[PDB]
Amino acid sequence: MITIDALGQVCPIPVIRAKKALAELGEAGGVVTVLVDNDISRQNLQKMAEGMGYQSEYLEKDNGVIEVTIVAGE
């Protein structure tokens, strides 16, 4: 699995880092989780995931951290 800490980064950086990580997983798929600090980023991350045909979920943790998990196949 791969976890990208993108806290403090402004869009579209989190989404770009996430997409690069997903495109790098090859046909084998896997899981990319991304830490973001605003709902807008979470939305952007989910639209990109749906766009690519990947399943995703998100969970709002403590201290405002949003974790968005994207699955390709792990």
Side-chain angles (χ1 to χ4, degrees):
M1 178 194 216
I2 178 277
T3 298
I4 300 192
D5 176 341
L7 295 167
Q9 290 284 168
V10 13
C11 286
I13 298 287
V15 167
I16 287 175
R17 289 184 61 196
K19 188 169 171 167
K20 296 189 51 154
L22 288 153
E24 266 115 78
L25 288 184
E27 311 297 325
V31 185
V32 178
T33 23
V34 194
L35 309 179
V36 295
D37 63 27
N38 65 79
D39 265 86
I40 297 286
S41 293
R42 184 271 303 172
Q43 303 171 45
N44 288 340
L45 285 163
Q46 293 202 299
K47 305 224 184 66
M48 176 273 289
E50 71 165 297
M52 300 183 79
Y54 292 141
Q55 297 298 289
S56 83
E57 283 297 328
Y58 69 102
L59 180 78
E60 283 156 3
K61 308 162 118 61
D62 274 351
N63 190 36
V65 173
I66 302 165
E67 186 161 343
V68 184
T69 303
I70 308 177
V71 180
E74 211 158 294

PDB file of all heavy atoms in Angstrom, residues 9-41:
ATOM      1  N   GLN A   9      -0.800  21.027   1.422  1.00  0.00           N
ATOM      2  CA  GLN A   9      -0.631  21.256  -0.010  1.00  0.00           C
ATOM      3  C   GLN A   9      -1.927  21.709  -0.644  1.00  0.00           C
ATOM      4  O   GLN A   9      -3.005  21.213  -0.303  1.00  0.00           O
ATOM      5  CB  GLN A   9      -0.093  19.980  -0.700  1.00  0.00           C
ATOM      6  CG  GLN A   9       1.359  19.652  -0.344  1.00  0.00           C
ATOM      7  CD  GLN A   9       2.377  20.571  -1.065  1.00  0.00           C
ATOM      8  OE1 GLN A   9       3.590  20.608  -0.735  1.00  0.00           O
ATOM      9  NE2 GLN A   9       1.883  21.316  -2.048  1.00  0.00           N
ATOM     10  N   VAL A  10      -1.841  22.670  -1.556  1.00  0.00           N
ATOM     11  CA  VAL A  10      -3.035  23.176  -2.170  1.00  0.00           C
ATOM     12  C   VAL A  10      -3.250  22.488  -3.480  1.00  0.00           C
ATOM     13  O   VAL A  10      -2.300  22.141  -4.170  1.00  0.00           O
ATOM     14  CB  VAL A  10      -2.986  24.777  -2.368  1.00  0.00           C
ATOM     15  CG1 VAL A  10      -1.563  25.301  -2.151  1.00  0.00           C
ATOM     16  CG2 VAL A  10      -3.473  25.178  -3.774  1.00  0.00           C
ATOM     17  N   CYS A  11      -4.511  22.311  -3.816  1.00  0.00           N
ATOM     18  CA  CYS A  11      -4.950  21.698  -5.059  1.00  0.00           C
ATOM     19  C   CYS A  11      -4.338  22.413  -6.277  1.00  0.00           C
ATOM     20  O   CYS A  11      -4.043  23.637  -6.214  1.00  0.00           O
ATOM     21  CB  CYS A  11      -6.484  21.735  -5.105  1.00  0.00           C
ATOM     22  SG  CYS A  11      -7.245  20.477  -3.957  1.00  0.00           S
ATOM     23  N   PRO A  12      -4.115  21.667  -7.380  1.00  0.00           N
ATOM     24  CA  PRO A  12      -4.379  20.230  -7.547  1.00  0.00           C
ATOM     25  C   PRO A  12      -3.204  19.274  -7.182  1.00  0.00           C
ATOM     26  O   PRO A  12      -3.143  18.178  -7.659  1.00  0.00           O
ATOM     27  CB  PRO A  12      -4.759  20.138  -9.020  1.00  0.00           C
ATOM     28  CG  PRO A  12      -3.722  21.060  -9.637  1.00  0.00           C
ATOM     29  CD  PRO A  12      -3.745  22.265  -8.682  1.00  0.00           C
ATOM     30  N   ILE A  13      -2.306  19.705  -6.317  1.00  0.00           N
ATOM     31  CA  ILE A  13      -1.174  18.887  -5.899  1.00  0.00           C
ATOM     32  C   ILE A  13      -1.554  17.518  -5.331  1.00  0.00           C
ATOM     33  O   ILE A  13      -1.039  16.490  -5.825  1.00  0.00           O
ATOM     34  CB  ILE A  13      -0.307  19.636  -4.842  1.00  0.00           C
ATOM     35  CG1 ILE A  13       0.258  20.921  -5.466  1.00  0.00           C
ATOM     36  CG2 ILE A  13       0.859  18.685  -4.271  1.00  0.00           C
ATOM     37  CD1 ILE A  13       1.385  20.740  -6.474  1.00  0.00           C
ATOM     38  N   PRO A  14      -2.480  17.474  -4.330  1.00  0.00           N
ATOM     39  CA  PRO A  14      -2.829  16.146  -3.787  1.00  0.00           C
ATOM     40  C   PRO A  14      -3.308  15.206  -4.852  1.00  0.00           C
ATOM     41  O   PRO A  14      -2.859  14.055  -4.872  1.00  0.00           O
ATOM     42  CB  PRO A  14      -3.913  16.435  -2.725  1.00  0.00           C
ATOM     43  CG  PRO A  14      -3.604  17.916  -2.279  1.00  0.00           C
ATOM     44  CD  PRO A  14      -3.297  18.544  -3.679  1.00  0.00           C
ATOM     45  N   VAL A  15      -4.171  15.697  -5.749  1.00  0.00           N
ATOM     46  CA  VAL A  15      -4.729  14.882  -6.803  1.00  0.00           C
ATOM     47  C   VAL A  15      -3.680  14.396  -7.798  1.00  0.00           C
ATOM     48  O   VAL A  15      -3.777  13.289  -8.297  1.00  0.00           O
ATOM     49  CB  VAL A  15      -5.845  15.603  -7.625  1.00  0.00           C
ATOM     50  CG1 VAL A  15      -6.147  14.792  -8.921  1.00  0.00           C
ATOM     51  CG2 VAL A  15      -7.119  15.680  -6.834  1.00  0.00           C
ATOM     52  N   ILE A  16      -2.716  15.259  -8.117  1.00  0.00           N
ATOM     53  CA  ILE A  16      -1.652  14.909  -9.041  1.00  0.00           C
ATOM     54  C   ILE A  16      -0.739  13.820  -8.405  1.00  0.00           C
ATOM     55  O   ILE A  16      -0.401  12.804  -9.040  1.00  0.00           O
ATOM     56  CB  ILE A  16      -0.856  16.203  -9.381  1.00  0.00           C
ATOM     57  CG1 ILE A  16      -1.748  17.060 -10.300  1.00  0.00           C
ATOM     58  CG2 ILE A  16       0.521  15.849 -10.039  1.00  0.00           C
ATOM     59  CD1 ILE A  16      -1.226  18.442 -10.686  1.00  0.00           C
ATOM     60  N   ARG A  17      -0.381  14.010  -7.140  1.00  0.00           N
ATOM     61  CA  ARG A  17       0.454  13.040  -6.472  1.00  0.00           C
ATOM     62  C   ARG A  17      -0.286  11.691  -6.428  1.00  0.00           C
ATOM     63  O   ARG A  17       0.282  10.630  -6.683  1.00  0.00           O
ATOM     64  CB  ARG A  17       0.816  13.593  -5.081  1.00  0.00           C
ATOM     65  CG  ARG A  17       1.817  14.783  -5.105  1.00  0.00           C
ATOM     66  CD  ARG A  17       2.263  15.287  -3.728  1.00  0.00           C
ATOM     67  NE  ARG A  17       2.953  14.226  -3.000  1.00  0.00           N
ATOM     68  CZ  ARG A  17       3.198  14.228  -1.684  1.00  0.00           C
ATOM     69  NH1 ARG A  17       2.802  15.247  -0.908  1.00  0.00           N
ATOM     70  NH2 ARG A  17       3.849  13.199  -1.135  1.00  0.00           N
ATOM     71  N   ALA A  18      -1.588  11.730  -6.151  1.00  0.00           N
ATOM     72  CA  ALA A  18      -2.374  10.514  -6.102  1.00  0.00           C
ATOM     73  C   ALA A  18      -2.466   9.863  -7.444  1.00  0.00           C
ATOM     74  O   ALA A  18      -2.328   8.643  -7.545  1.00  0.00           O
ATOM     75  CB  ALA A  18      -3.839  10.792  -5.544  1.00  0.00           C
ATOM     76  N   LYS A  19      -2.699  10.649  -8.491  1.00  0.00           N
ATOM     77  CA  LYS A  19      -2.836  10.044  -9.797  1.00  0.00           C
ATOM     78  C   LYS A  19      -1.509   9.401 -10.267  1.00  0.00           C
ATOM     79  O   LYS A  19      -1.503   8.316 -10.868  1.00  0.00           O
ATOM     80  CB  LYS A  19      -3.347  11.085 -10.835  1.00  0.00           C
ATOM     81  CG  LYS A  19      -3.695  10.439 -12.178  1.00  0.00           C
ATOM     82  CD  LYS A  19      -4.437  11.404 -13.077  1.00  0.00           C
ATOM     83  CE  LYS A  19      -4.589  10.851 -14.486  1.00  0.00           C
ATOM     84  NZ  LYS A  19      -5.574  11.672 -15.260  1.00  0.00           N
ATOM     85  N   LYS A  20      -0.402  10.064  -9.992  1.00  0.00           N
ATOM     86  CA  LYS A  20       0.928   9.551 -10.351  1.00  0.00           C
ATOM     87  C   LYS A  20       1.132   8.228  -9.610  1.00  0.00           C
ATOM     88  O   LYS A  20       1.615   7.249 -10.167  1.00  0.00           O
ATOM     89  CB  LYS A  20       2.029  10.498  -9.886  1.00  0.00           C
ATOM     90  CG  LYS A  20       2.021  11.869 -10.527  1.00  0.00           C
ATOM     91  CD  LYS A  20       3.287  12.649 -10.171  1.00  0.00           C
ATOM     92  CE  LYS A  20       4.547  11.851 -10.433  1.00  0.00           C
ATOM     93  NZ  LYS A  20       5.713  12.746 -10.695  1.00  0.00           N
ATOM     94  N   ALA A  21       0.787   8.197  -8.339  1.00  0.00           N
ATOM     95  CA  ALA A  21       0.966   6.938  -7.608  1.00  0.00           C
ATOM     96  C   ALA A  21       0.094   5.812  -8.157  1.00  0.00           C
ATOM     97  O   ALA A  21       0.544   4.617  -8.190  1.00  0.00           O
ATOM     98  CB  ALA A  21       0.696   7.127  -6.097  1.00  0.00           C
ATOM     99  N   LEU A  22      -1.143   6.138  -8.567  1.00  0.00           N
ATOM    100  CA  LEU A  22      -2.036   5.103  -9.106  1.00  0.00           C
ATOM    101  C   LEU A  22      -1.584   4.604 -10.483  1.00  0.00           C
ATOM    102  O   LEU A  22      -1.589   3.417 -10.748  1.00  0.00           O
ATOM    103  CB  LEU A  22      -3.475   5.609  -9.170  1.00  0.00           C
ATOM    104  CG  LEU A  22      -4.141   5.734  -7.798  1.00  0.00           C
ATOM    105  CD1 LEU A  22      -5.246   6.811  -7.804  1.00  0.00           C
ATOM    106  CD2 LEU A  22      -4.648   4.351  -7.398  1.00  0.00           C
ATOM    107  N   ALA A  23      -1.189   5.518 -11.349  1.00  0.00           N
ATOM    108  CA  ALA A  23      -0.737   5.162 -12.688  1.00  0.00           C
ATOM    109  C   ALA A  23       0.551   4.324 -12.630  1.00  0.00           C
ATOM    110  O   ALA A  23       0.909   3.628 -13.603  1.00  0.00           O
ATOM    111  CB  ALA A  23      -0.498   6.467 -13.532  1.00  0.00           C
ATOM    112  N   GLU A  24       1.252   4.394 -11.495  1.00  0.00           N
ATOM    113  CA  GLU A  24       2.498   3.658 -11.347  1.00  0.00           C
ATOM    114  C   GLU A  24       2.381   2.232 -10.853  1.00  0.00           C
ATOM    115  O   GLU A  24       3.341   1.474 -10.952  1.00  0.00           O
ATOM    116  CB  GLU A  24       3.456   4.439 -10.462  1.00  0.00           C
ATOM    117  CG  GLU A  24       4.397   5.296 -11.308  1.00  0.00           C
ATOM    118  CD  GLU A  24       4.187   6.771 -11.098  1.00  0.00           C
ATOM    119  OE1 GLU A  24       4.682   7.271 -10.060  1.00  0.00           O
ATOM    120  OE2 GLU A  24       3.526   7.414 -11.952  1.00  0.00           O
ATOM    121  N   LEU A  25       1.189   1.891 -10.351  1.00  0.00           N
ATOM    122  CA  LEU A  25       0.819   0.579  -9.823  1.00  0.00           C
ATOM    123  C   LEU A  25       0.635  -0.518 -10.877  1.00  0.00           C
ATOM    124  O   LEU A  25       0.388  -1.688 -10.535  1.00  0.00           O
ATOM    125  CB  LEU A  25      -0.517   0.649  -9.098  1.00  0.00           C
ATOM    126  CG  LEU A  25      -0.659   1.315  -7.762  1.00  0.00           C
ATOM    127  CD1 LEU A  25      -2.114   1.101  -7.289  1.00  0.00           C
ATOM    128  CD2 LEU A  25       0.349   0.741  -6.777  1.00  0.00           C
ATOM    129  N   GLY A  26       0.687  -0.152 -12.137  1.00  0.00           N
ATOM    130  CA  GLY A  26       0.504  -1.159 -13.146  1.00  0.00           C
ATOM    131  C   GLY A  26      -0.827  -1.909 -13.075  1.00  0.00           C
ATOM    132  O   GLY A  26      -1.776  -1.539 -12.334  1.00  0.00           O
ATOM    133  N   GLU A  27      -0.882  -2.971 -13.873  1.00  0.00           N
ATOM    134  CA  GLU A  27      -2.041  -3.826 -14.004  1.00  0.00           C
ATOM    135  C   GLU A  27      -2.353  -4.517 -12.694  1.00  0.00           C
ATOM    136  O   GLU A  27      -3.470  -4.958 -12.467  1.00  0.00           O
ATOM    137  CB  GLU A  27      -1.780  -4.889 -15.104  1.00  0.00           C
ATOM    138  CG  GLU A  27      -1.241  -4.321 -16.428  1.00  0.00           C
ATOM    139  CD  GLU A  27      -2.236  -3.380 -17.095  1.00  0.00           C
ATOM    140  OE1 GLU A  27      -3.439  -3.640 -16.996  1.00  0.00           O
ATOM    141  OE2 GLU A  27      -1.832  -2.385 -17.724  1.00  0.00           O
ATOM    142  N   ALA A  28      -1.369  -4.618 -11.818  1.00  0.00           N
ATOM    143  CA  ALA A  28      -1.582  -5.301 -10.535  1.00  0.00           C
ATOM    144  C   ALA A  28      -2.457  -4.478  -9.552  1.00  0.00           C
ATOM    145  O   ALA A  28      -3.033  -4.994  -8.596  1.00  0.00           O
ATOM    146  CB  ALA A  28      -0.228  -5.620  -9.905  1.00  0.00           C
ATOM    147  N   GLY A  29      -2.604  -3.195  -9.786  1.00  0.00           N
ATOM    148  CA  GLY A  29      -3.427  -2.483  -8.828  1.00  0.00           C
ATOM    149  C   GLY A  29      -2.809  -2.427  -7.443  1.00  0.00           C
ATOM    150  O   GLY A  29      -1.693  -2.898  -7.186  1.00  0.00           O
ATOM    151  N   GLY A  30      -3.571  -1.880  -6.528  1.00  0.00           N
ATOM    152  CA  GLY A  30      -3.089  -1.685  -5.186  1.00  0.00           C
ATOM    153  C   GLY A  30      -3.926  -0.610  -4.528  1.00  0.00           C
ATOM    154  O   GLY A  30      -5.047  -0.292  -5.003  1.00  0.00           O
ATOM    155  N   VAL A  31      -3.369  -0.013  -3.483  1.00  0.00           N
ATOM    156  CA  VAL A  31      -4.110   0.973  -2.704  1.00  0.00           C
ATOM    157  C   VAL A  31      -3.326   2.240  -2.504  1.00  0.00           C
ATOM    158  O   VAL A  31      -2.159   2.160  -2.135  1.00  0.00           O
ATOM    159  CB  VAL A  31      -4.440   0.393  -1.305  1.00  0.00           C
ATOM    160  CG1 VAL A  31      -5.315   1.396  -0.552  1.00  0.00           C
ATOM    161  CG2 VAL A  31      -5.167  -1.001  -1.430  1.00  0.00           C
ATOM    162  N   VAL A  32      -3.954   3.411  -2.746  1.00  0.00           N
ATOM    163  CA  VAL A  32      -3.247   4.662  -2.512  1.00  0.00           C
ATOM    164  C   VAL A  32      -4.099   5.451  -1.543  1.00  0.00           C
ATOM    165  O   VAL A  32      -5.273   5.770  -1.827  1.00  0.00           O
ATOM    166  CB  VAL A  32      -3.006   5.495  -3.841  1.00  0.00           C
ATOM    167  CG1 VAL A  32      -2.294   6.858  -3.508  1.00  0.00           C
ATOM    168  CG2 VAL A  32      -2.142   4.648  -4.888  1.00  0.00           C
ATOM    169  N   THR A  33      -3.565   5.755  -0.380  1.00  0.00           N
ATOM    170  CA  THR A  33      -4.335   6.582   0.571  1.00  0.00           C
ATOM    171  C   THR A  33      -3.657   7.943   0.542  1.00  0.00           C
ATOM    172  O   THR A  33      -2.413   8.024   0.397  1.00  0.00           O
ATOM    173  CB  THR A  33      -4.323   6.082   1.983  1.00  0.00           C
ATOM    174  OG1 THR A  33      -3.189   5.285   2.176  1.00  0.00           O
ATOM    175  CG2 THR A  33      -5.431   5.226   2.217  1.00  0.00           C
ATOM    176  N   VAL A  34      -4.473   8.991   0.672  1.00  0.00           N
ATOM    177  CA  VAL A  34      -3.968  10.356   0.643  1.00  0.00           C
ATOM    178  C   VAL A  34      -4.485  11.150   1.829  1.00  0.00           C
ATOM    179  O   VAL A  34      -5.692  11.161   2.083  1.00  0.00           O
ATOM    180  CB  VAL A  34      -4.454  11.078  -0.633  1.00  0.00           C
ATOM    181  CG1 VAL A  34      -3.629  12.422  -0.858  1.00  0.00           C
ATOM    182  CG2 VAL A  34      -4.426  10.114  -1.811  1.00  0.00           C
ATOM    183  N   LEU A  35      -3.596  11.807   2.543  1.00  0.00           N
ATOM    184  CA  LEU A  35      -4.026  12.671   3.643  1.00  0.00           C
ATOM    185  C   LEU A  35      -4.202  14.141   3.142  1.00  0.00           C
ATOM    186  O   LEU A  35      -3.232  14.761   2.593  1.00  0.00           O
ATOM    187  CB  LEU A  35      -3.009  12.616   4.783  1.00  0.00           C
ATOM    188  CG  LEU A  35      -2.603  11.220   5.282  1.00  0.00           C
ATOM    189  CD1 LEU A  35      -1.538  11.346   6.435  1.00  0.00           C
ATOM    190  CD2 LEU A  35      -3.864  10.501   5.815  1.00  0.00           C
ATOM    191  N   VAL A  36      -5.423  14.668   3.251  1.00  0.00           N
ATOM    192  CA  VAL A  36      -5.698  16.082   2.877  1.00  0.00           C
ATOM    193  C   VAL A  36      -6.394  16.841   4.018  1.00  0.00           C
ATOM    194  O   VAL A  36      -6.921  16.252   4.972  1.00  0.00           O
ATOM    195  CB  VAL A  36      -6.482  16.252   1.539  1.00  0.00           C
ATOM    196  CG1 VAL A  36      -5.608  15.739   0.414  1.00  0.00           C
ATOM    197  CG2 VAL A  36      -7.904  15.496   1.561  1.00  0.00           C
ATOM    198  N   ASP A  37      -6.291  18.170   3.977  1.00  0.00           N
ATOM    199  CA  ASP A  37      -6.868  18.980   5.037  1.00  0.00           C
ATOM    200  C   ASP A  37      -8.075  19.815   4.625  1.00  0.00           C
ATOM    201  O   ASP A  37      -8.336  20.832   5.250  1.00  0.00           O
ATOM    202  CB  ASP A  37      -5.793  19.888   5.632  1.00  0.00           C
ATOM    203  CG  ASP A  37      -5.229  20.894   4.611  1.00  0.00           C
ATOM    204  OD1 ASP A  37      -5.935  21.274   3.651  1.00  0.00           O
ATOM    205  OD2 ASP A  37      -4.062  21.322   4.800  1.00  0.00           O
ATOM    206  N   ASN A  38      -8.803  19.428   3.584  1.00  0.00           N
ATOM    207  CA  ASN A  38      -9.988  20.215   3.231  1.00  0.00           C
ATOM    208  C   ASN A  38     -10.859  19.334   2.363  1.00  0.00           C
ATOM    209  O   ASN A  38     -10.351  18.474   1.646  1.00  0.00           O
ATOM    210  CB  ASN A  38      -9.576  21.554   2.501  1.00  0.00           C
ATOM    211  CG  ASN A  38      -8.913  21.305   1.169  1.00  0.00           C
ATOM    212  OD1 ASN A  38      -9.582  21.032   0.194  1.00  0.00           O
ATOM    213  ND2 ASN A  38      -7.589  21.350   1.133  1.00  0.00           N
ATOM    214  N   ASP A  39     -12.171  19.557   2.437  1.00  0.00           N
ATOM    215  CA  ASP A  39     -13.177  18.778   1.716  1.00  0.00           C
ATOM    216  C   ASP A  39     -13.107  18.864   0.229  1.00  0.00           C
ATOM    217  O   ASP A  39     -13.506  17.945  -0.493  1.00  0.00           O
ATOM    218  CB  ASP A  39     -14.578  19.229   2.129  1.00  0.00           C
ATOM    219  CG  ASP A  39     -15.155  18.390   3.204  1.00  0.00           C
ATOM    220  OD1 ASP A  39     -14.885  18.675   4.403  1.00  0.00           O
ATOM    221  OD2 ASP A  39     -15.886  17.430   2.819  1.00  0.00           O
ATOM    222  N   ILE A  40     -12.657  20.023  -0.229  1.00  0.00           N
ATOM    223  CA  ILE A  40     -12.526  20.278  -1.637  1.00  0.00           C
ATOM    224  C   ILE A  40     -11.523  19.296  -2.243  1.00  0.00           C
ATOM    225  O   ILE A  40     -11.750  18.734  -3.306  1.00  0.00           O
ATOM    226  CB  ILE A  40     -12.037  21.739  -1.873  1.00  0.00           C
ATOM    227  CG1 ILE A  40     -13.097  22.734  -1.352  1.00  0.00           C
ATOM    228  CG2 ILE A  40     -11.789  21.961  -3.375  1.00  0.00           C
ATOM    229  CD1 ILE A  40     -14.325  22.810  -2.253  1.00  0.00           C
ATOM    230  N   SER A  41     -10.421  19.086  -1.556  1.00  0.00           N
ATOM    231  CA  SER A  41      -9.409  18.156  -2.064  1.00  0.00           C
ATOM    232  C   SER A  41      -9.978  16.744  -2.120  1.00  0.00           C
ATOM    233  O   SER A  41      -9.772  16.005  -3.117  1.00  0.00           O
ATOM    234  CB  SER A  41      -8.162  18.181  -1.171  1.00  0.00           C
ATOM    235  OG  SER A  41      -7.508  19.435  -1.277  1.00  0.00           O
TER     236      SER A  41
END
